[PDB]
């Protein structure tokens, strides 16, 4: 009784506390202002903004929820511009987006069959049923798709369909169907075994029905991965050309993709550095590669970003958007808002923010530059590019502090050749046992 | 030298002061917020708003820059509604507005002739030239017009012309002409005397030219003051009627105006109470009545407002708009904004605010109700009505505190019969010598 | 521009206090005192007032101090709050000058407290610039060719060394037909920095 009493909200206590807080001038000022405006609008610190909104970067690349696909295909887009002397060029994101969604719906049916032994109310089965066709993904999922499907110019398959730019309704219609199929499969698996002719036939009818519904909202791409397409275009000089190629040959011959060089490093302080981290079950293409990260410290993660940028290549990275991100000015700085002035401070550290459900990776973006300090020999800020129209931020360009990178970013993607042999070996040796995390881990899919 | 040095802005001092202010938390909070938002938007105190925005009034009237004319004609408008059993009705403001402007332009020419002895750069002549045709006025100026012109229903002469609702350009064109005429008159008065045939002819040609330019922007009313008009209308029951009347007979017979009963009281602490105050030269109709106020204390001014409201009549009053007036919520309260929380306090008293160019009468409005405290026997707040469309305030309705009335209001208009004999006598006795103030005094014309 | 705008406003508020002390002998309702009280902190100025500020404060690149604050692009409310205070200070000064003389220790202290209070209120709406006129700033920039550079300079050295200002060459000519041509015209009292140059025109 005494415990529950002490643990209850006591009316005299809160009114006494109120009287005490109301006697403080800062508090009186703060509650006047915070009843009138959104705290971020009210506390944005222009004095800090003045110093941090710096768009001078001495280390830049020379060139100029589906974000993960725009960020992932960017370099390949640049390789084509260069290889073909183009003025402008876009790879088709819709191409990858259509197959990702089909594969994910197909993947879910397999996840359901493999988890059929578990109770319908189990944590995994409910988790599988929550959002089987979400638009986000990881870099490994992007490579799984390019290895099977290749890449094609946006001119052959663009963002024309309604659902390519407003996928919410489409996903909901598919998901409702997938939830029905989950029950139908689990129900048929009570009697028959999975290899049973009936389950095999049922799974195929389901693939058919998923494909049929998808074909209503988006067309299947115009050519198969090994089928040739003819593409007419104009180079920087107004000269015309025709390329005959297949999607697969195109990803390699023109976009120069070598799927075996990309590796993802991550700063996840919940785990020891030097270890490989694998997210169980997270995927898109059945039988494709797993999401694997090599865990490293921020110093290491920062040097790698600088080295890649020095090799004139942008860096794919994942972070917690939109934590401490000001879209209006395009600034990512954890001290840009004056919360300490209202006594609001946040001591919880990175590893704990992750464990306690406060911070996770949510979006993928591109680092295209940085500023390394002459004195010292370290990065101070990074130039970041988003896929949110030329209107978000400074014409879509953001500036991010080193501290933001350390605290609210986690993963970067680099080529294994850019790593020190001691780290590259972690991937090639075949001796590392990864730490295996649940499918629902915060270090997952990116928008 | 030491004086000028001590009196200069010293860079070390202001930077030292800055360091001291920046060490205070309230200050740090305040400069963050005040660089982001307008101080009134930021400091509006909703906690105070919650208590002061009270629209319950136990003392209300039973009925339901040209504001001074809408406020001035309102009662007469109600008298007509009642006298004719009308559902809706408006007196024509444009009627009064057209003659006010003509008379004012004519008045200016006379002010110029009477001040011709003074230098062109004198304070009075420059003041006369500043805004000879402004739209604002005083209650005496309103009576000067009704006594000569009468009143007509809005149905016969409405706010149709562009310049009746956007008079800025019209006034500027007239004023430019009037400034030319001022020189032409002063120039002709160097040789000839004012009664000289030539000056008389010149003044008439100027009246003609003013009238001609005015007739381009607004038509002269359709009937003369003693000429009959025919007005067709429908009463509350959908029954039709025709009234044949002249503007003058109409102001008296239907709108029930008796120009000899209205008197204006004012609270001007710069002067002793019990004295009559006259604003020199301020007028519209040449030879009409002067602007005269009987100076009284706030207790007296407040009791008179209550008494008039008890006689079921609204009260014309002048105040300093928009000091401490929140248009969005429709509240007039000098403590509604939390300026003390940023250390901004204003000790300067009423009489001093007036002398030091900080507060003056600027607009005329209507008090249509008030709340007198059961305990005590005094008014707590007033219901105020503005002529700013149903969109300003609470459907055009404001609530004003007793303190606001005391500090930022000055004049009210009442019937001499409502005054205590000791005050009424101040007007009838013929023994009072008014304190005479300059034409540029803050206790002047209202918008 | 905000750099110059912040000091112009501070100096003007400071200037007004001095105009009030020097006109204290005149009646509160006199033409000059009422004129002084009308708009002591208006945003406008003359070229001489601009030179008075550059000579004392110098110039800095907009990248170090921009038009970020609300009041830099909508100064009406800020000016009104300052002006209301300045009108209160005018009375407090004239009232204290009835007894004591201007050099009196009390008037000197009072004037300083007023400067302090003006500066404090201004610092709520705009920050004092990041460096003093003789203090060095570091400025990073990119030239037409995408090459990066860092300039270390003080605001004063910057107005001269990079912006090439020589405050002694600018002169203002005017066509004012009210007066004879060939004459110099001086506008009495019009200024911003106490003791700075007067507004003078050659007609």
Swiss-Prot record, chain C:
Post-translational modification: The N-terminus of isoform Cytoplasmic is blocked.
Coiled-coil spans in chain: none
Family: Belongs to the peptidase C1 family.
Self-association and partners: Homohexamer. Binds to nucleic acids. Binds single-stranded DNA and RNA with higher affinity than double-stranded DNA.
Misc. comment: Present with 521 molecules/cell in log phase SD medium.
Protein's job: The normal physiological role of the enzyme is unknown, but it is not essential for the viability of yeast cells. Has aminopeptidase activity, shortening substrate peptides sequentially by 1 amino acid. Has bleomycin hydrolase activity, which can protect the cell from the toxic effects of bleomycin. Has homocysteine-thiolactonase activity, protecting the cell against homocysteine toxicity. Acts as a repressor in the GAL4 regulatory system, but this does not require either the peptidase or nucleic acid-binding activities.
Official protein name in the record: Cysteine proteinase 1, mitochondrial
Native species: Saccharomyces cerevisiae (strain ATCC 204508 / S288c) (Baker's yeast)
Encoding gene per record: LAP3
